[PDB]
Symmetry: none
Subunit: 1032 residues, 2 copies
Amino acid sequence: MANFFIDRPIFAWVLAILLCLTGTLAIFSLPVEQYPDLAPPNVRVTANYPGASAQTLENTVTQVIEQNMTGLDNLMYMSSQSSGTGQASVTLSFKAGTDPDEAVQQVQNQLQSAMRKLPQAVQNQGVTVRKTGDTNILTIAFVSTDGSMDKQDIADYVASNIQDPLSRVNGVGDIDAYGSQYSMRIWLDPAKLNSFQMTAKDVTDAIESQNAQIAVGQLGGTPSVDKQALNATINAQSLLQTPEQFRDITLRVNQDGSEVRLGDVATVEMGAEKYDYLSRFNGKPASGLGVKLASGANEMATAELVLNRLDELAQYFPHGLEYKVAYETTSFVKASIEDVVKTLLEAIALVFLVMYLFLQNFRATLIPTIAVPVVLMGTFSVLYAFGYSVNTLTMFAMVLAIGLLVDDAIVVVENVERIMSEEGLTPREATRKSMGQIQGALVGIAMVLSAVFVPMAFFGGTTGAIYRQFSITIVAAMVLSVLVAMILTPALCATLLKPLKKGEHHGQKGFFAWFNQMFNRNAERYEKGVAKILHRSLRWIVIYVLLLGGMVFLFLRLPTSFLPLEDRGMFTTSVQLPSGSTQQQTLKVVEQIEKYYFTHEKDNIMSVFATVGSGPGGNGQNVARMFIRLKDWSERDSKTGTSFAIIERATKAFNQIKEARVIASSPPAISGLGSSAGFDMELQDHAGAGHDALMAARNQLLALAAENPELTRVRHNGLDDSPQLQIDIDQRKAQALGVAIDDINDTLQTAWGSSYVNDFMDRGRVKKVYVQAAAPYRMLPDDINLWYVRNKDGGMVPFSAFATSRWETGSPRLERYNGYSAVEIVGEAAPGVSTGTAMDIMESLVKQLPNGFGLEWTAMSYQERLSGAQAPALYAISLLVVFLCLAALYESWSVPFSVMLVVPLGVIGALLATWMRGLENDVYFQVGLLTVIGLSAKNAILIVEFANEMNQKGHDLFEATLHACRQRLRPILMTSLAFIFGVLPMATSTGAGSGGQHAVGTGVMGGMISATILAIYFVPLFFVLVRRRFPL
Amino acid sequence: MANFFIDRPIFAWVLAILLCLTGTLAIFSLPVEQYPDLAPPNVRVTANYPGASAQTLENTVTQVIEQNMTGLDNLMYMSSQSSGTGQASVTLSFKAGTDPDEAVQQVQNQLQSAMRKLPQAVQNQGVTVRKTGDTNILTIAFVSTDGSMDKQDIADYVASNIQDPLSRVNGVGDIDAYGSQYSMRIWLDPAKLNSFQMTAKDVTDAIESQNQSLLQTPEQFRDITLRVNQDGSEVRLGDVATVEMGAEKYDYLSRFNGKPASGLGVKLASGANEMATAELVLNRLDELAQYFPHGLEYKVAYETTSFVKASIEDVVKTLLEAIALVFLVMYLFLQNFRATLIPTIAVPVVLMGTFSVLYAFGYSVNTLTMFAMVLAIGLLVDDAIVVVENVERIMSEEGLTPREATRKSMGQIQGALVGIAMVLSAVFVPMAFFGGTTGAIYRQFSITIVAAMVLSVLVAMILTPALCATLLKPLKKGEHHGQKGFFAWFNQMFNRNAERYEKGVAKILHRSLRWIVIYVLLLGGMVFLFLRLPTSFLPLEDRGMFTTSVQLPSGSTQQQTLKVVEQIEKYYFTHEKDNIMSVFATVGSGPGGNGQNVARMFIRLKDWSERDSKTGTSFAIIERATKAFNQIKEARVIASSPPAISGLGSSAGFDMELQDHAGAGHDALMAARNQLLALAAENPELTRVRHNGLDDSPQLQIDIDQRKAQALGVAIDDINDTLQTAWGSSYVNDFMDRGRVKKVYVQAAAPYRMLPDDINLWYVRNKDGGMVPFSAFATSRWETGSPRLERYNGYSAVEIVGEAAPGVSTGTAMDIMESLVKQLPNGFGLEWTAMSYQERLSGAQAPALYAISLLVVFLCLAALYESWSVPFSVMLVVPLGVIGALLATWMRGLENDVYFQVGLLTVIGLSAKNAILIVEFANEMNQKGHDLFEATLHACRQRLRPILMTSLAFIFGVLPMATSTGAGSGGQHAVGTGVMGGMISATILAIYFVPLFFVLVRRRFPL
């Protein structure tokens, strides 16, 4: 194989060009992402029980649904919520890698099973099963520049002309509206309704009958008369347009001639919702749109399309209206990807320079360099074939790969150079002999550098996915490198390399002359030291045992985490006032926060978009969210302008604020995983105690978390108990009175809440018609008697006769986790403290709580615990696979055992580097540690394979190992330095996703430094000792 | 390899016979189609909202479904129609190659979520997801010869006894009926109703109450008691209304050859074979015919299998003629009969092996694969011809025995055999990876041509060496020697011309600069011709059918449409009689939509043999019709030929969607559409430009004073029910006729539902039981609404279709249309759909294929011959053939379509073949050490004969295609013309320029 392509260089060039072209096509056709899915698919089951208390809804529906749902295929954990508004939502998160469609089908089947057991009212209302994609790809704010357009006018225009076309953009799962369009809202006064003896049902029926559009046939139908002239459709009536027409709805004509008009019994207005989002942008009234990314769609492409369409729509906005991008994700993705590309190019440059240092010949430097584009584009082709994408994980794997993939090319080139320099052979003969000598070594290096990343691919969860991303890329790169090393590089060495003895490089003074002198002297000293330590075995065995102990100590000492946080240029601050607070107080607090951000962080804030209130769909107005967008990373400082510094500085001031609970939190590392950054904990009530007991436990936990300085921004992701109405309707009492269940239910919906009726055409656009009770009347325990519902006989049975309403203090929103009343508690670790330490502290605090209150981590916390628990297995499996592969290659057990003893020499260096830098044991460290294992095995192989060959030929073990070290010192050094300077830009990256780059690069760089400076001495010791113990 | 079969011929014979047998088995088990599955898969979601206006239907139903369906996999585009009848259909088309079942499953999953959001009435009706067939395999008509059976009787019999059996025939996805079953029509009379003081609701309720015993005869219905007077007298239904057994639907009034008839539109089930399904349908119909009442007879008004069969037969004929011409030219160059037979025997083996490969890969016998086979016939014989020619030359000169001569020849040209196959197969590889309809077409050819090439190399190194070692006789110096007739003159002429050619090649080698300038000029001319040449997708074919569409002004009655249809039918019967077999018309059915003002008429022409080749072509008669039809000002009448691909679009030409890219206003959209139609009518490059839709129609909106209605104690429900019963129709109950359950409808008699003031003739029953006239609380008013609303990719749109004027390509027409759209008021943009979208995609992605194919061929040659110089020398001759292909295509009036693209690829391969045949031998001689001039001159002298004979074999193989006159003449001409011109130029230029390129490259880069 190697000899075949030596004499046919053009064939090798053609193969390389084919790989390059396929890779270029793949690159131009590969999708761009920040991360892959990496998120457990979630399916949400939603049910509605109108006019039902939260506890009653939870008991009658939520629990039942959960019971049937339990026992699914890959159900990781069930989380459920029961709201006072009457909506029950049970969320089912499935194990990562589960196809969402199959999960949805299973949930639908079990919902079919459970639907009968549910209350018939809920069944009539309808139960919905859908895969929930809640990733907010971008949030858009529409603000009137001139001020001519009112906030309600802005909301109406947006919901009429912008929301509808944007919803039709590809990949837009759901576009939330932070403002509501106008609607023909009709406010019923029960006083007038009882005055004229008309129930709300009569009003609804009159609106339905009078405001309608029905086709009744055709003028001039097909069996027409002999000579008709016109064929036209006939419509029964028209849809009302102005509010005045609604006021003229008849509803009755008395015998005297008087008519009880709708305006006589109610008031109609083309207004907006009673409690609409009081959205603001940079201290100005504005409306908003929240675009959510549909499941299984590319965020960047969808955002570009939406932005694109919005740009088009903008061209047709009324004078003085413009759109602002309050929240954007693709900016960070583009910045991070471009930064990683710059890092990769800098890595290629540094690898070229370090190779040129050892190989002064320019062509000899080019020959391994050419392997980089070929293997890189082949890896891109492999990624395209397997359906992977260009994300941060794959790009990090590529940058890691560079130094590994250049290894075999470097080995071949320098072996050819050594043969040319010493034996004096021609480049062709030198290449032949070099391939014959080191054919085994290349295969061994590829095996050790690829076997480490195989087992990782067989794990599951988000962790397994991350591992797989690295595996595929790195395994493909290693396979191509070993293919390139035996196809392209031998031909290049046989052709590109000039004899180089005519040029007389020896005697050429300069920097390279001094470098060669230093290298030769140090190599001689190194061989002397290797001989000495071979003689003095016991001392270095003791040193090795001490290194093992230090490695264990650093392993236990190192804090753990899942994924480094990144400066995305955004963070969200949440405002929660004490329960019962009006929207105006929340607005005042929001104004205070905006003033703080404008007057303190004036050099970093680009725009703040606040959203006061829960909106029309919700219960309390004491909630506000504030989307904060920072300036570009270049504009902001690298020390005080970072997102983390801004968040901490704001957190101090906001913790000073006592008016309301205000927390500034960075966005989560993974969009679909968790709501915000930091740990995510569910405080389950295992004892089954009361809800108030759970609330007291929650308060104790929050107080303790506030006490500990290791924890910051600890908050309850929920709502506090507040007085709530509970309309209780006795079905048997109503049926004794003969009043229909449907009629009383509709009347209850109309009075307590709002009832949609039909549509009316406004300016050519259809808009909804809502029938609602008057402002003072909200089906209070007092006014329930004022409402009347006629029975079958027609007599106006009073509502109070069959229904009872009473104020009750309880939680508006009840939550459950895995069959246990629980409250979700979220928080973040203090600066300098890892997430794992924060989780340990939270576990200690929950232990400090009274009995019966266990905890269960969810989302990113759950998967971080999974990765931490599963990490030792991988290491063990990867080491075992490397050992078995090495035993298979050399058909011996002494050689692989000698190699595996060098693995601790790299792990100690990686641990030292991460510990000194201040990083933590995350997933990246794990994959890094795996890379360090592979490279330590690489150096060990580079020595022991030649030593074993020499021994098998019959040379003395001492002489054989000394000769092997002397010859292979330069290959080990230059390959390792190539890798070190390849990963150096990662460890010193600035801006964009610099945190991930640092986390990946630091550990591997330290591992390489230790691996060289320890292996070059210990590998001879291991090989000699093992061979003495087990002779040939 | 070669030597093995030389000494063991029996093994090679066994292999050849095995391949032939496998191919023969494959041929008789290979399905036959006109085209493979080239149309993108379409999924249609239909929703029915009864009693809903078009605008209401679009707002409440269509928009919801469109919003939910967004996000599907490989969703090319969405098009939706909100008809005034209450039916909304959102058509989703996916990328070509997408699994239809997977698409349907995804659509159903997305619809399940959307079901809840829909109005309750729509959910009760039921939204249906179905793979869109929309391909009329055949339109059969049933006409009573005697006239005893009335048109409605024909329709009823068809629905009762024919529609059901045919629908169960395998492969019949749907069977549209242009008739209606019997129904007990009860025509009310408001005057009689007032006489007896009964409202329409009284009659409706009574008839509902009356009804397993069901009334059968009309008389039994006329005996229905509506009211019993106190005197004992009872009011009968016949006393107040007229009972008749008519149709449940009067929408369609079909007419065959000026005679009443009813029709069935048979539609193909997705994936089924067209020819087999049509044969089954017809067979079944024959069985049914065995029991048709006297006088009734079915007649095929539309048929596709006729053209498919005729075209396939024509392509087989041209294939056989190509084989014969290849044999003749080989016999011209190889005077010995056995020497000619040896390459000929390779043709059946390679062809049948290709058939086996197609059967294994699942491909069928379509026009594309057959064209590829015809091309391969000239392509495949190249290696066998080279082997035989080299053997003959060695025997003539060295005098060796056939066995040793074949051995030496195989040793000498083993490299060239591999190189020719490599270049002829590497061009067609990248083409296979392309997508869309175009990629599918490419693949049909690639698979076929690449398989043929591989089998050609295999036969050339296995079968032909054995044949040369056995069949050939040393009689070349014997029987063959001593020629005196025509062949002697031919040999003398060829020898003299070869000497002249070699001398000229030497001279041109001396005069390099002049011919370099000539080559640069040829490059410039090639670029100029490529830019000037117009573009298209596929050539239109005279399929013996075409359709004319009638669209009277909105609001026109059925009778006026029938009058215009009669005028058109008279035109066809008189002016164009020697070419028209039959005309089948259907009032009420149209491409854009259904209505009394729209009629669609099917015209079937006589056989191609009967019709004139010049004035009887479908295009000529259609142009004459358009000249005549354009004069008709009563209506818009357009005669359109069938689309190139059945599933791609509704009709031939371009297809675009003028849509409001922003802003709004349906009236603004209609005004823009009118402007666009006027501008298109102005242009002389565009013909038959129209919009596939319905203009805004008058609508009679009734206004009801609810105050007066309640003052008189009249319920709104009653006044809606009376209006629906009178103007619309009322499905009161069912009745059984001849063992079949049929509907009973109650409706006002025609004279009383014919004017807007007829609303005042009706009465309602108030709460007290009195008769309140409608005039008390009803006011009629005229308005204007759109019967059918369209949306394309979300935006409101109007579908505008049309065709290019004769002499103008479809691409030029599309450019003209894009120019016209820019003249519209700001906010309106266009998107190309159907086949037009695919044409734009193919044109956009065309330069890539060429670049990639050229690069792949270059790299393969460099890998094979281990020198950059050889492919550089070879690739320089590609323009020498491309110029000829472009010149021939431009001269013959053809355009740059898909076939031309595959042709350009074939021409690239042929130019590479000739360049290889020269430079391989020249490079070998130079590497052996011979002088470059001597090497190239010797290579030209020796390889002139094989190059000329292979090239002539190919050109005369494609000659019948370029001069075919059968059913598929257009496609055969499009494929053959460019390739033939390219090959001609490739020979007559390469045989001189290739030495120049090789010599110049070697001098610049000495070995």
